Amino acid sequence: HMSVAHGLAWSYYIGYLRLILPELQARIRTYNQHYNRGAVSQRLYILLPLDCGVPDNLSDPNIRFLDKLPQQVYSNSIYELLENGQRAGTCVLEYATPLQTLFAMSQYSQAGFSREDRLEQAKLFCRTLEDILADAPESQNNCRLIAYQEPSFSLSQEVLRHLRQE
Amino acid sequence: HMSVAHGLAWSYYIGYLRLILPELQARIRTYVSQRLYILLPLDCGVPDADPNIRFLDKLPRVYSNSIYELLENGQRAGTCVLEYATPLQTLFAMSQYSQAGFSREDRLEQAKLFCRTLEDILADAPESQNNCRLIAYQEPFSLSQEVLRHLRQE
Ligand SMILES: CCn1nc(C)cc1C(=O)Nc1nc2cc(C(N)=O)cc(OC)c2n1CCCNC(=O)OCc1ccccc1
């Protein structure tokens, strides 16, 4: 209840996920009802790279930006997940911002924080966030956490493994 | 670093202050003191505050900040871009949510740890010392006087 990763998971929920998820299904449903290659899935897919290697802003060639999810100010992007050149799925995808902070804390002396500490805190953040989202009222059936560690790796396949299984 | 406060201080810098401060002086110069004044109430009571702090205009990632006129005796004594440190709202919410297991004593201790951690980060950050001032305080009071004590001394 006092760790670095506990503070970050509660902040990401309090200051962002609790304010965006109550209206996320309505925005996806509106875009699906109004427009149409494939229906956009009803959940927010949050990428959780355990190595905390999050691009500055956001990101594989098989993950093509399709459009922005409009409001009923949050810019949420819809991506087309490709396989063999053709679209295999489509969803609102984004990186878990607090993993950038865990990476920065490991790079700056002022924090200390080793590479082993960062990897342990990243899994702890993922666990704490999972536990928050399981019991949170504003996050019932519209959020899926995608945690993974790169060792042949495809980010599009990791998201497709979760989209097909739902 | 070690605790909840350290993660919040580094997040506040990484995800917001490092992206907004490089261009803050240019926005103020285009449009008021040249620094961002961040209110840090140690009780984490972040609402909005005082009749002597009147909203003047908006300063035309980081998306817009408010300029306020600090009054004293009915007349304007200063003007600056002022805002609350959002992570203190999170410390307050963590104390109000059971699944966080964070007491009122924990919240006050983490609030001070956050102020000191963010002051150290900002002293050595290339995002610059000249564009940001932290205003930490605990109510036993005028919020306009606390800001004026820092504006006049700079
Ligand atoms: C605080 C929650 N948190 N704790 C940890 C740890 C990580 C996060 C996090 O990822 N937060 C987050 N992510 C976002 C993503 C989006 C999007 N476009 O998808 C929008 C958002 O909200 C506009 C997002 N937030 C909210 C805060 C960031 N914005 C900000 O500081 O804005 C300055 C500002 C100041 C005055 C006026 C207007 C803006």
Author numbering:
A (entry chain A): 152 to 187, 191 to 213, 216 to 228, 239 to 317, 322 to 336
B (entry chain B): 152 to 182, 194 to 210, 215 to 226, 238 to 317, 323 to 336
What does the paper say about this structure?
Since M271CH3 and A277CH3 are >10 Å from the binding pocket, it is likely that the large chemical shift movements are caused by agonist binding-induced allosteric conformational changes rather than direct interaction. By mapping the chemical shift differences between STING-bound ABZI and THIQi onto crystal structures, we found that the hydrophobic region harboring V155, M271 and A277 beneath the CDN binding site is significantly perturbed, indicative of distinct conformations between agonist and antagonist-bound STING155-341. Chemical shift differences are mapped onto (c) STING155-341-THIQi and (d) STING155-341-ABZI structures.
We show hydrophobic interaction in this region plays an important role in regulating STING activity.
